[PDB]
Design a protein around this ligand. Structure first.
Ligand SMILES: [Mg+2]
Ligand SMILES: [Zn+2]
Ligand SMILES: [Zn+2]
Ligand SMILES: [Zn+2]
Lengths: 186, 56, 100, 137, 56, 144, 92, 49, 56, 56, 118, 65
DNA sequence: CAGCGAGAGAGAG
DNA sequence: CTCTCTCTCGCTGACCTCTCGAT
RNA sequence: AUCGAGAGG
C-alpha cells in the first residue's frame, strides 16, 4: 500500500563466538552507526531494563539468552530516558530527537505500521527479531535458508503491469499538475 | 581478444555431421554445394593447364 | 611414524596427543563464577571435600570448572596435568586447586 | 546408425512421412518520412532505383507485390518498395529479398493499413520439407 | 531372472536391516565415534557405504 | 455407495473437473482479471487528489471509478470499431482497451476523460473471446 | 463443500500428506514380483492426500511416456526437445 | 497473541472450507514454534490437495 | 518430503531408490532422482565455464 | 576445440548429400556425436599452408 | 544463574559484597534497594549445554501430524502413545538421541541409557 | 491432417477404409481392433496409420473463409 | 570472490 | 615510538553456432 | 547497429 521500495532492518550480534563484549545492535535506516537495542527500546518508550528483556525474551526460564542480553543492558544503563536515546541518533538538539521520532514512525518496521502510538507493537517485533538472532546464536535453531519456496514469491503479469501502471499514472498526474501550475487562466 | 586473437575467416564452412562407415578415417565427406562454394587459388602450370582449362 | 616404528598404535596415539591442540575449552563442560566467603569453607559440598583432601589450604570469588571425563580420557592429559598447565600459565597471579 | 544416428526407410518417406509444411512470412510497411514524403510500393525502376538488390524483379508484379502461386528461390524479390531520396537514381531500393536458402511457393500476400495509416504487406511463402539426411529426429 | 531378482531384493532388505540397526544403536546413544568425527558424521558414512555396497 | 472411498482412477475425474473449471493458463488470466477489476481502482484512489493552493484558493481534482472499454481501436481517420485478436495480429496493431476515468474537478476557497489505452490479455473477462462460443471462435478465426 | 483445499509451501510444512488414497485405507504377504517395491507409509496421521502423484510433473514432462522408468536427465532433455518438435500448433 | 489456538484453528479451517475465509489464504501454525502465521499474500504457489 | 514423517533418517526418506528402472520408480524416488539430475546438469554447464577459464 | 586433436587435417572427398561425413573412429578425438553436432571445415589457400596441414 | 532486578523499578541488580560479614547481596543502581543473595553464583557459563534438547513441549505437540509416533512406552504413566523427535538443538556436534514425549501425563523419556538428567 | 493414402512401411492403401471404419465402430459399437481386422489391416503398421491418425481437416473446414 | 594493495593502526617489541 | 604485522575495503576478471524480437 | 530473448551442440 505504501511505496514499494524496501527499508531493510539489520540486527546483528557483535564479537566472535568466543569473545567478551558481545552486543546486539541494530541499524536504523537513516543512521550512520548501529545503535544498541536498549537505546532503541528506550527511544521506543520501553524504559525498564527488565521490561526490555521481557520484550526480547518471552520465557522466564532460559538464563542463557538473558545473560547474552546483559552486556547490552550495560550499554543501556548509560541512557535511562527516552529523550537521550532519541538524542544519540544520527549525525549533524530537540531537532535531533525529532528526527529520531520521525524515523521511528516511518523508517523502522514500516510494514507493521507507520502511524504514531504503535511503538509498543514495533518494540515487540524488534524483541522477536533479537530472540531469533539469539536462538541461532544459541544453536537451538538453525539459520533460515533463502531457497525455501514459501519464502519465494512469483510475481505474475497483473502485479507487473500494476507497478508500471502506477508509475505512468503518477507521471501523467504530475504532467496534468504542471499544466495547471503553468496557466492561471486555463 | 575478439578481433586480433580470433578472427572470422574467409574460406570457412560448417555442417551438421553424420558418419560414413565406407569413408576412410583421414578423409572428410564434403557436400557438393560446399565444395562448389569454396575455392583454392592454383597457379597455372604446364602440368595443370589442361585440367584447369576443363575445370573452368 | 618414526622410522622403524610401525604397528605402534599407542605411539601414534601419543604423537596425536602431542600434535593435537588441546584447550581448556575442549575439555570443559562448564564454567561457574561462585562467591565463597571463606577460603577454608566453600559453599559447594564437593569443593569442601576437595578442601579436606589437601590439608594445606586472595579473593572470596571462586571460578569453578567442570570438565568431562570422556574427553579427558580421549586426551592424554591427566586432570592434575591440566591443573598444572593452568598454574604455570597463571604465573601464581591466580591460585588453582585440582580434584583428583 | 552409429553415434545415435538413424536410418529411415526411403520408401516410407516417399509415402508422406515426417513431411512438414514450412511457412515463412515476410513483412514490410510503407515508411512515412513525414512532410508529405512517403516510401512507395511499386516494382522498382532500375534507372530510378540505386543499389537495388541483385535479384529477379520479373516475378514481382507492377504493384511491387508478388502474387500467390509464384515460385521464388534465392534472390527473387518478394516485396518491392522504393525510398525517395532528397536527380538521377532518385529512388533507393527498399525491396525485400527472399532469404537465400529458401525455395518457396507464395501461399498468400496480405496488404492492409496500420493505425498510423501506412500500408503493410505480409508475404507468406510455403515450402514442403521432406526428411533429408542429417535432419534432427 | 526371478530367482536373481529375489536375491537382489533380499540384499536390499539385508542392507536396510543393517541401516535400521545402526540407527537404533545411534538412538540408544551406545555408539563408537571416530576421533575427530561427529557421531552423526560416522552414522552418515556407514549408511551411505551400506547402501552403495548393496547397489553394487 | 456414496460413502465408499475413492480409488486412484476416481482421482483423475477430479483432475478433469479441475481443468474444465480452470484450464491450463488459469493463473495468468486470474492475475490479469484481478488487476483489471480491483487494482486499477486502488491505483487511482491512491494519490487520487492533487491540489495547489494560494489563499491571497485550492484546486482539487478527484477521480471516480475507472472504466475499461471492451477492447477496440479507432483507425486513424476512421470510426472507432471493435478490434479482434485475429485482426489485431494480422494488422500489427496492439490489442487495446480504453481507460476512461470519471473525473470530478472542484475549486476550494466533466464527462469521462480517457486516460489511456491498456493492452488486454487474451481470454480475459474484458476480451471478447472469453464470452464467445466455440463456433463464434471459429468465425472470429481464433482457434478453439 | 470443503472436500479439497489449497496449500501454500509454508502451509505444506505443517501438513502430512499421502500420495495414494489406498494407503490411508487401513492395512492389516504375497505380491507380484514385477510391481515396483513401495515402502508402506508407516505414518499414522494424514491431514491430506495427493490428488495424483503425476501432477508434480510439468506439461512437457507429462508428455514423457514413462519418466518413472527412465533417468531424470533424459526427461529434462525431452522436456526441452519436445518444444522443438513439429506439430499442428493451432487449427487457425 | 492468542490462547487455546487449536480451537481457533479448527474454526478458521472450517471457515475456509465454507469459504468465508478465502480459499487462497494460507494459515500456518507450528505448535513447537508456538507461532501462527496467516498469509493473505499474493504470489504464493499453492497446490490442490 | 511432505509425505514422509518428521525426523526420518530412514533410507527411503533419505533418497535411496530400491527400485530398478525396469520395475518403475515411486513418486518420491523420482523426485529425489530429479534433484540429483538437476545438480548434475548445473554441475555440467557451470563447471565447464570454470574449467575453460582454467584452460585459457 | 580443447585440443590440437580437435583441429585435424582431412582429405577432401565430395559426397552427394548435405551432411559432412567423417569416419566412426575419428569422432573420439573430435568429441563428435552424430546427433545434431555441427563441425567446421577450413580450406588452406597457399601451397606452404597446405603442406603444413598435410605434413603435421 | 537467576537474574534479579529491584522490585520498584525493574532495572537490573548489580552484585555487591559486604566485607565485614563477608556476604553477597545485589543492589540496583536506579533505587538504593539491596537484597541478600539466595544462591552464591554470580555467573554460569556452559561450554556444552544439554538445554534445548526439549524445546517448547506443549500438550498440543501431541496433536501435530508431522511428528512421528513411537512404538515404545513411558515407564511413568505407562502411556503407549508418545511422540519422538531428534534433539532440537542444532549443533556441529549433536547426539542422535531420540527424545520421546508422552501424549498423556507429559512425561519426557530420553532414549539414551547413559544419562537420566532432566 | 487427412487420412493417409498408404501405410508408410508397406504402402498398402488405407484411404479407402477410413470412412467405412469410422462408421463400423459407430454402427456396431465395435471395438477398434475388430474394425481394423475387418478392414484387413492385419499388419500393425497399416493398423497404426488408421488408429493414430487424427482428422484435422474437419476443424479446418469449420473456418468460414 | 579473493586479493594484493596501499592505507591506516594499535602493538609488541 | 614505531614500523609492522593486522586489518582493511577495493576490481577484476572470468567454446562456437542458429533463429527471433524489439529499439 | 544496439540491447535483449530463445535455441543447438
Ligand atoms: Mg549434436
Ligand atoms: Zn530500582
Ligand atoms: Zn507418561
Ligand atoms: Zn503396413
Amino acid at each position: 500500500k505504501g511505496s514499494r521500495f524496501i527499508s531493510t532492518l539489520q540486527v546483528k550480534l557483535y564479537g566472535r563466538e568466543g569473545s567478551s563484549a558481545r552486543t546486539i545492535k541494530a541499524t536504523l535506516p537513516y543512521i550512520k552507526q548501529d545503535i544498541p537495542i536498549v537505546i532503541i527500546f528506550r527511544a521506543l518508550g520501553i524504559i525498564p531494563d527488565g521490561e526490555i528483556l521481557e520484550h526480547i525474551c518471552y520465557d522466564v526460564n532460559d538464563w542463557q539468552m538473558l545473560e547474552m542480553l546483559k552486556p547490552c543492558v550495560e550499554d543501556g544503563f548509560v541512557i535511562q530516558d527516552r529523550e537521550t536515546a532519541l538524542d544519540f541518533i544520527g549525525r549533524r538538539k530537540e531537532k535531533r530527537i525529532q528526527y529520531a521520532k520521525d524515523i521511528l514512525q516511518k523508517e523502522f518496521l514500516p510494514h507493521i505500521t507507520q502511524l504514531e502510538g504503535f511503538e509498543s507493537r514495533k518494540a515487540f517485533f524488534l524483541g522477536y527479531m533479537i530472540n531469533r538472532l539469539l536462538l541461532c546464536a544459541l544453536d537451538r535453531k538453525d539459520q533460515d535458508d533463502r531457497d525455501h519456496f514459501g519464502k519465494k514469491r512469483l510475481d505474475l503479469a497483473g502485479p507487473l503491469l500494476a507497478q508500471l501502471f502506477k508509475t505512468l499514472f503518477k507521471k501523467l498526474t504530475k504532467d496534468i499538475f504542471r499544466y495547471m501550475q503553468r496557466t492561471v487562466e486555463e | 581478444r575478439g578481433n586480433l586473437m580470433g578472427k572470422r575467416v574467409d574460406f570457412s564452412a560448417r555442417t551438421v555431421i553424420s558418419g560414413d562407415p565406407n569413408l576412410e578415417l583421414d578423409q572428410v565427406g564434403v557436400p557438393k554445394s560446399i565444395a562448389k562454394t569454396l575455392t583454392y587459388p592454383e597457379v597455372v602450370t604446364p602440368y595443370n593447364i589442361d585440367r584447369l582449362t576443363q575445370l573452368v | 611414524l618414526e622410522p622403524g616404528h610401525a604397528a605402534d598404535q599407542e605411539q601414534a596415539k601419543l604423537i596425536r596427543s602431542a600434535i593435537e591442540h588441546t584447550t581448556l575449552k575442549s575439555v570443559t563442560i562448564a564454567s561457574e563464577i561462585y562467591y565463597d566467603p571463606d577460603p577454608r569453607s566453600t559453599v559447594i559440598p564437593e569443593d569442601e571435600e576437595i578442601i579436606q583432601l589437601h590439608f594445606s589450604l586472595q579473593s572470596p570469588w571462586l571460578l569453578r570448572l567442570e570438565l568431562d571425563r570422556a574427553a579427558m580420557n580421549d586426551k592424554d592429559l591427566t586432570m592434575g596435568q591440566v591443573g598444572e598447565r593452568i598454574k604455570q600459565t597463571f604465573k601464581n597471579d591466580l591460585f588453582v586447586i585440582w580434584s583428583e | 546408425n552409429q553415434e545415435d544416428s538413424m536410418i529411415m526407410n526411403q520408401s516410407s518417406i516417399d509415402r508422406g512421412l515426417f513431411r512438414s509444411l514450412f511457412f515463412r512470412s515476410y513483412m514490410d510497411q510503407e515508411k512515412k518520412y513525414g512532410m508529405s514524403i512517403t516510401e512507395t510500393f511499386e516494382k522498382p525502376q532500375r534507372t530510378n532505383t540505386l543499389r537495388m538488390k541483385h535479384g529477379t524483379y520479373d516475378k514481382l508484379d507492377d504493384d511491387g507485390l508478388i502474387a500467390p502461386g509464384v515460385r521464388v528461390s534465392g534472390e527473387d524479390v518478394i516485396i518491392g518498395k522504393t525510398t525517395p531520396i532528397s536527380a538521377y537514381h532518385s529512388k533507393r531500393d527498399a525491396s525485400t529479398p527472399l532469404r537465400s536458402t529458401e525455395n518457396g511457393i507464395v501461399d498468400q500476400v496480405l496488404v492492409t493499413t496500420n493505425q498510423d495509416g501506412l500500408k503493410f504487406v505480409k508475404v507468406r511463402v510455403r515450402t514442403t520439407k521432406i526428411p533429408q539426411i542429417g535432419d534432427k529426429f | 531372472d526371478g530367482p536373481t531378482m529375489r536375491e537382489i531384493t533380499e540384499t536390499i532388505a539385508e542392507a536396510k536391516k543393517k541401516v535400521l540397526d545402526v540407527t537404533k544403536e545411534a538412538q540408544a546413544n551406545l555408539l563408537t565415534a571416530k576421533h575427530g568425527m561427529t557421531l552423526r558424521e560416522s552414522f552418515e558414512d556407514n549408511v551411505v557405504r551400506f547402501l552403495n555396497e548393496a547397489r553394487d | 455407495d456414496e460413502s465408499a472411498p475413492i480409488t486412484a482412477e476416481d482421482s483423475w475425474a477430479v483432475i478433469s473437473a479441475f481443468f474444465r473449471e480452470k484450464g491450463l493458463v488459469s493463473q495468468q488470466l486470474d492475475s490479469f482479471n484481478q488487476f483489471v477489476d480491483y487494482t486499477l481502482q486502488d491505483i487511482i484512489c491512491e494519490d487520487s487528489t492533487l491540489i495547489l493552493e494560494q489563499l491571497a484558493r485550492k484546486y482539487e481534482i478527484s477521480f471516480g471509478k475507472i472504466y475499461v472499454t471492451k477492447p477496440m481501436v479507432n483507425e486513424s481517420d476512421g470510426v472507432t470499431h471493435a478490434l479482434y485478436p485475429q485482426e489485431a495480429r494480422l494488422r500489427n496493431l496492439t490489442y487495446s482497451s480504453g481507460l476512461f476515468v470519471d473525473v470530478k474537478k472542484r475549486t476550494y476557497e466533466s464527462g469521462k476523460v480517457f486516460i489511456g489505452r491498456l493492452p488486454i490479455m487474451l481470454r480475459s473477462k474484458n476480451c471478447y473471446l472469453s464470452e464467445a462460443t466455440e463456433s463464434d471462435l471459429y468465425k472470429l478465426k481464433e482457434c478453439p | 463443500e470443503g472436500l479439497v483445499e489449497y496449500i501454500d509451501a509454508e502451509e505444506e510444512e505443517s501438513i502430512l500428506i499421502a500420495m495414494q488414497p489406498e494407503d490411508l485405507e487401513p492395512a492389516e504377504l504375497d505380491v507380484d514380483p514385477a510391481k515396483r517395491i513401495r515402502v508402506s507409509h508407516h505414518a499414522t496421521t494424514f491431514t491430506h492426500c495427493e490428488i495424483h502423484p503425476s501432477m508434480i510433473l510439468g506439461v512437457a514432462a507429462s508428455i514423457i511416456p514413462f519418466p518413472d522408468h527412465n533417468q531424470s536427465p533424459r526427461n529434462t532433455y525431452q522436456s526441452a526437445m519436445g518444444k522443438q518438435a513439429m506439430g499442428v500448433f493451432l487449427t487457425n | 497473541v492468542h490462547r487455546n489456538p487449536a480451537r481457533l484453528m479448527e474454526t478458521l479451517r472450517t471457515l475456509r472450507r465454507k469459504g468465508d475465509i478465502n480459499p487462497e489464504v494460507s494459515m500456518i501454525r507450528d505448535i513447537r514454534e508456538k507461532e501462527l502465521k496467516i498469509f493473505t499474500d499474493a504470489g504464493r504457489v499453492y497446490r490442490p490437495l | 518430503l511432505p509425505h514422509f514423517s518428521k525426523d526420518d533418517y530412514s533410507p527411503e526418506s533419505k533418497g535411496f531408490v530400491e527400485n530398478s528402472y525396469l520395475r518403475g520408480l515411486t513418486p518420491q524416488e523420482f523426485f529425489f532422482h530429479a534433484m540429483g539430475g538437476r545438480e548434475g546438469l548445473i554441475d555440467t554447464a557451470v563447471k565447464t565455464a570454470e574449467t575453460g577459464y582454467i584452460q585459457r | 576445440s580443447l585440443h590440437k586433436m580437435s583441429m585435424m587435417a582431412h582429405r577432401v572427398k565430395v559426397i552427394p548429400y548435405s551432411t559432412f561425413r567423417l569416419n566412426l573412429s575419428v569422432t573420439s578425438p573430435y568429441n563428435a556425436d552424430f546427433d545434431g553436432d555441427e563441425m567446421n571445415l577450413h580450406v588452406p589457400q597457399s601451397e606452404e599452408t597446405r603442406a603444413e596441414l598435410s605434413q603435421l | 544463574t537467576t537474574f534479579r532486578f529491584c522490585r520498584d523499578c525493574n532495572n537490573m541488580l548489580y552484585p555487591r559484597e559486604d566485607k565485614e560479614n563477608n556476604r553477597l547481596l545485589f543492589e540496583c543502581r536506579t533505587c538504593s534497594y539491596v537484597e541478600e543473595a539466595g544462591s552464591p553464583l554470580v555467573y554460569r557459563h556452559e561450554l556444552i549445554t544439554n538445554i534445548g534438547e526439549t524445546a517448547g513441549v506443549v500438550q498440543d505437540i501431541g496433536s501435530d501430524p508431522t511428528l512421528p509416533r513411537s512404538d515404545r512406552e513411558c515407564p511413568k504413566c505407562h502411556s503407549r502413545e508418545n511422540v519422538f523427535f531428534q534433539s532440537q538443538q542444532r549443533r556441529k556436534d549433536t547426539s542422535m538421541v531420540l527424545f520421546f514425549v508422552c501424549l498423556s501425563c507429559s512425561h519426557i523419556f530420553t532414549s539414551d541409557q547413559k544419562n537420566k538428567r532432566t | 491432417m487427412i487420412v493417409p493414402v498408404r501405410c508408410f512401411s508397406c504402402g498398402k492403401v488405407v484411404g479407402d477404409k477410413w470412412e467405412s471404419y469410422l462408421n463400423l465402430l459407430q454402427e456396431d459399437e465395435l471395438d477398434e481392433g475388430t474394425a481394423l481386422s475387418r478392414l484387413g489391416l492385419k499388419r500393425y503398421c497399416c493398423r497404426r496409420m488408421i488408429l493414430t491418425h487424427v482428422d484435422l481437416i474437419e476443424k479446418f473446414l469449420r473456418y468460414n473463409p
